[PDB]
Amino acid sequence: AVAVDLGNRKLEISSGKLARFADGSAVVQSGDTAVMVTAVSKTKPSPSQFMPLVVDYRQKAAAAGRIPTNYLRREIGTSDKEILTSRIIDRSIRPLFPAGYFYDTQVLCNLLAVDGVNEPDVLAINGASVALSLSDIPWNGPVGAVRIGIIDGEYVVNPTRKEMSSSTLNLVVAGAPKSQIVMLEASAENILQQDFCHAIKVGVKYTQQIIQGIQQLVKETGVTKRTPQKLFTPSPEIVKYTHKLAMERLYAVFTDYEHDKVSRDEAVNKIRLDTEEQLKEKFPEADPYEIIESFNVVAKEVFRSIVLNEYKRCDGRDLTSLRNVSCEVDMFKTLHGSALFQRGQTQVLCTVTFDSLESGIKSDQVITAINGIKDKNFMLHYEFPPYATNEIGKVLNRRELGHGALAEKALYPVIPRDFPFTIRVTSEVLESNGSSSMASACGGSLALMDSGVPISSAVAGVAIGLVTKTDPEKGEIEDYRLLTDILGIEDYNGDMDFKIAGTNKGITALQADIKLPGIPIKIVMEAIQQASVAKKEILQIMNKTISKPRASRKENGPVVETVQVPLSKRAKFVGPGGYNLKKLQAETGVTISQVDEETFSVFAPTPSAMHEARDFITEICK
Template sequence: MAAPCAVDMKLLMFRRFCRFLPERGSTLGTPFLWKSCPGPGRQPVRRAYQQLWASNTVRGRVSVDQGSSRKLEISTGKLARFADGCALVQLGETSVMVTAVSKTKPTASQFMPLVVDYRQKAAAAGRIPTTYLRREMGYTDNEILTSRIIDRSIRPLFPSGYFYDTQIVCNLIAVDGINDPDVLAINGASAALALSDVPWNGPIGAVRVGLVDGEVVINPTRKEMALSTLNMVLAGGPHSQVVMMDAAAENVLQQDFCHAIKMGIKHTQQIILAIQQLAKEHGNPKRTPQKIFVPPAEIVEYARQFASEKVRGVFSDFTYDKVSRDDAINKIRLETEELLRDKFSEAEPFEIMEAFNVVSKDVFRNIVMNEYVRCDGRDLRSLRNINCEVDMYKPLHGSALFQRGQTQVLCTVAFDSIESSIKTDLITTLISGVKEKNFMLHYEFPPYATNEIGKIVGQNRRELGHGALAEKALKPVVPKEFPFTIRVTAEVLESNGSSSMASVCAGSMALMDAGVPISAPVAGVAVGLITKKNPEKPAEIEDYRLLTDILGIEDYNGDMDFKMAGTSKGITALQVNETIVPLFIK
């Protein structure tokens, strides 16, 4: 007799198992709890599912009215429940799922290791990718730029010294071609972090602000955006705080811009209240980190006594340039760190290094706050010396060199047929309606621009972001019906602050040198901020100083980097990055 096959054996075992099951219709046959019938050899059988996983219903949901019978809905509790926090945000038929996960053990990195991944999948639009393998291969430019916007919106609100690997993943579930998912992803990241146990001083709310026929439109549809002269993504914190701004405009006046910001902040407060309600009802208690990487006050005070006057002497000597100033500060740093290591032998290397950083930063800021003078001798509103050259290389269609202080950018212009225009990806085409673009600006930042060594392998996220900002600034002045594809290449040759805005200036000159009939010249400048907090209420700003045309060290030691570009008629691009508690709008 032949041995039974595997199928027969499985069938036989299944029949024997079925003899012990309750009869059909018995109350013992529920899927969540089986009780054994009395009898010898029978053991109780029970499925120990937790209540959270036993139900597929949504645990919590809040909605915010967006006008025109539209509602922004934020829900949690149904998807991705192993993540520290998860939120599903929906507007119209566009849905984005965002998860937040942070490790409980600190990383070896001496900075906040935050990673934001925003992914646009063709399946969300009911499409199949056009790649050879018919799947998403790498990040598109739009995915990287959206990831940067989310990062800039949430990073300032993590506790100082929180060096734990943290990842935000934004998964585009569905897109309707009417509502843009990037703003939903920012709100989803805010909700996911607020619901999680990850330490974070949120939530925030985000909206897109448009300007159609002089009227402000909040979260405009694709049709409304086609008529809008403003495309601004705005993230706000509680109590009407400004966290992040990123805008492209068509010569919008300053007063109209300010009105749009105030209206946008007003609507972010409704989203913040909804997220706070959701977190209160369904959120987790915040964890206490194993360690916050902040130098002890004793070490900082010892470093201050030894190094503060020496550092002040360097920052008050206006003969230093970028390289010589950095060398002088590094010499004092090495002396201070050696002294601290001898005095505090048990201190960690980070505490020694950061103690000097705290002292150096405080001295730098106090000189600006109290003496109204900067480390290069300028007052708070003065620009650095500017030199310009055009038509530098005859074989090129256009070229220009822009020098502002120790920031130098070379821009070139190349023309090609309209068939050389960039074809956008499926999702970007569906969202914006733009299938191709015939104007592009590529920004390059080689390591020699800051006297460093490194590999030059394609564009990194920073280069892509700076290039996109400069492209936004120049695009409104380029004729829409220009019969050629235009590529502007901006290469940073020297960098000491605001190289993206120098690229705008050089790009504008290169376009004119190439004979492009732009409607007006464009210029850009970066503005910095140094604040003094209220000792009794650290969350409040007691005093501040605005710095025009900032240096690299002013960007590093300051609280804000405000980049703005425009023509004599109005603003064409704007970007705000903050490193402190969000600013209150006035």
């Protein structure tokens, strides 16, 4: 039992009492909120040729504490808050696993109690670190996680629910030993870059105190890490031979600036086919997967050496240049708003649909409390069809759900208040070669302006890559390069996917997907600054297509007006138990609600829809 003090909060960490059969277990308590996290890792190697790691964060109360149970009454599935928290925990712990740890691993978070004051999502990240630290699963140093908010200009560590609602910043920082950063996830109300950068430095300082406390608990209880059967990494002898065979051919492919996505991959695949054939001959007894991974290591090394040595990217761009950006609005007449955003070979179609206010709340209390009503009546739906990458796939996706929330909070600060309709932005990825999620914010802002929503300002996002050269002995970063508007290959062979969105005068969202086991804080600051100048250029291009919201909504847009029905005719109009109202609203598409005993409010998505419902009302009234 080790206590950690963070300014004015307490973090009680304990182990050895509950769930003693799991490989690792821990209980993290702040105030009256307790979360127990367990870690289980199979001893046998996994058949899958990667690191199978799943994180499941389960809650029992929907609206924190207030709803008693969602699991007892509704087994229908996992909300988006549970999925998002699982992704944040997964991002914080995955980089610290050793390379080649091909073993099935599950991290489960069980919310023992919640007081409705201290949020359990932050304690769940720390619980995963403590459970993995005390376990025998091979894992690197402990990770501390805090949430930084800004209330009345002051930075608050782990703000309560009451303060979180009044905060202009919602930033979560996961830090490694030596003040490294392994996870960043923020949503801000268009705050300045200077305020945003200060909060990151404050957060990393607080996570070091948690790491010191966890290391103390690891010292008290004897922790002996297991020895895995074998770590699945290609042998240096095989990797060296692959470098001799295919360095020149791979170098020529990556120095050929005429390649597109499909031709670059085909050229690399042709080298892979030839090299793997002679690799098996040289090593007849080698693992078949070891041949595949050895080529991927050599190809990644060759790709990264060009950026570091020559400052030239595989498509001929320099470190700061953007890809070609094309914008378009008013694609189809019947849509309330539309926009087609193109960035290199990434195409995104964004649509804006207006709906009734009542569409937010559905199906009694528990269902509408599992997924709470959005603060402003505005949600974003993200789709990643299989053909976006020329693929076959079945049509709950974790990546697509997470990207939708990332783009939704990027556009959230500029959405106006008290809009007379629900705003539903649908972002569809038609072609994928880069940051389609960031293109959803740019295209979503264009479609919002085209639909007539009076947003405060345009929102643009970009992804910043990173290529580093780490010393094999010290482990420190000798030198690094930051890339603007990375491709798919640069993200695949890079060290991070630093997606950040915002307006021209502020920052609205950030999601750093760091693949390295921690990066220095100054690299994060330079990534924010590099993306600041890249965002200005993108907003310059988008403003040429459209610079301000349209004066009025489209003529074929939704209408809302009241209809008066007498007391005598209400029985016939509503029908037996509201059957007539439910029948009319189901075929003509309108939504009718009673505001009082006399007047009803009718919402029709199109003027034609209201025309049908208007004659239907009058014929009953006569």
